[PDB]
Design a protein around this ligand. Structure first.
Ligand code: HEM
Ligand code: HEM
Ligand SMILES: Oc1c(Br)cc(Br)cc1Br
Lengths: 137, 137
C-alpha cells in the first residue's frame, strides 16, 4: 500500500528520485525552464552533475517525509505551507505540482514494481488542495 | 458512501442520534456514569427525558460537522482540539470515543438503511488518533 511505497522509494531514493523527476520533465518538457542548468543536457549528462543527484534526492526525501506524515493520504497543512513558503517555489502555481503527480502516477503504473498508484494520485490531489489553501495560486 | 451517510443522518438527525447513542449506552452500560440520570432507565424512558434527546441531537450535530469537515475521513486537528478542550469532556480518554465508534459501526452494519460502515470505522480511528495528537489521554 501507500506506506510500503514510501519504503520502496526510500530504499533506492537516488534511482527513483532521478527516474521520476526525468519522467516529469519528459512528460512536461516546458517544466524544465524552472531548472535553468538542466536545459540542453542528456539524462546521462544530468546524472554526472552533483546538484542534479542532490536536488532530486532531496526533493524526493521531503516528498517522502510529507507522505509519511500524512494520514490516509491527507498531508499536514504545515507541510503544505513549507512547500509554498520554500523562496525555490516563489514562481509556482498548483498546476506545476499537479503535473509532478500525474507524471509520478504514470511512472508508477508503468513500472515493474507494485505501487499503490491511485493512493499517490489521491495524495497528489490532497496536496494540491492544501497548497491552494496555504496561498499558492 | 461517507459523504452521503452524513446527509442520510442529517435528514433524520434526532432519530439516528438517539438510536446510535442508545446502541452505545446498551453495548457499554458502564458509559452512563459520565452522564447524569441515565442509569436505571429503559430506551423509551431515556427518549422521554427532557435533556436526553436534545444533548444526543447536539452531540451528533457536531459529529456530523466534524465528519463533513474531514478529508478522506481524516478530521481537522482544530475539530479534535475542540473536543479535547470542551469542559464537558474533561473526564474522558480516547477509549471513550473508540467505544462510541465501535457501537456506531455495529449499528450501521445492523440497519436496513445503506451505510459505508468501513468509512465510519476509519473515521473513528482517525478521530481517536487526532484526539491523542491534541493531548487527550
Ligand atoms: C511535493 C513536491 C515538491 C517537493 C517536496 C519539493 C521540494 C524541494 C526541495 C527540498 C528543494 C530544495 C533542494 C535543495 O537545493 O536542497 C526544491 C527546490 C526546487 N523546487 Fe521543488 N519540490 C516540489 C515540487 C516542485 C515543483 C512541482 C516544481 C516546479 C516544476 C519545483 C521547482 C523547484 C525548483 C526550481 C527548485 C530549485 C532548484 C534547485 O534545487 O537547484 N518544485 N524543491
Ligand atoms: C465525536 C464524538 C463526540 C462529540 C461530537 C461530542 C459533542 C458534545 C457536545 C456538542 C456536547 C454538549 C451537548 C449539550 O450540552 O447539549 C457534549 C457534552 C457531553 N459529552 Fe460529548 N461528544 C462526543 C463524544 C463523547 C463521548 C464518547 C463521551 C463519553 C462517553 C462524551 C461525554 C459528554 C458528556 C458527559 C457531556 C456533558 C453531559 C451531557 O451532555 O449530558 N462525549 N458532547
Ligand atoms: O519537486 C518534484 C518535481 Br519538480 C518533480 C517530481 Br516527479 C517530483 C518532485 Br518532489
Amino acid at each position: 500500500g501507500f506506506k510500503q511505497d514510501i519504503a520502496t522509494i526510500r530504499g533506492d531514493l537516488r534511482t527513483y528520485a532521478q527516474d521520476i523527476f526525468l519522467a516529469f520533465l519528459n512528460k512536461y518538457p516546458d517544466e524544465r525552464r524552472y531548472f535553468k542548468n538542466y536545459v540542453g543536457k542528456s539524462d546521462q549528462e544530468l546524472k554526472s552533475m552533483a546538484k542534479f543527484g542532490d536536488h532530486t534526492e532531496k526533493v524526493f526525501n521531503l516528498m517522502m517525509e510529507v507522505a509519511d506524515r500524512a494520514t490516509d493520504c491527507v498531508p499536514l497543512a504545515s507541510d503544505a505551507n513549507t512547500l509554498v513558503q520554500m523562496k525555490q517555489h516563489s514562481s509556482l502555481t498548483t498546476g506545476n505540482f499537479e503535473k509532478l503527480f500525474v507524471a509520478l502516477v504514470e511512472y508508477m503504473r508503468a513500472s515493474g514494481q507494485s505501487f499503490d498508484s491511485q493512493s499517490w494520485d489521491r495524495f497528489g490531489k490532497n496536496l494540491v488542495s492544501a497548497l491552494s489553501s496555504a496561498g499558492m495560486k
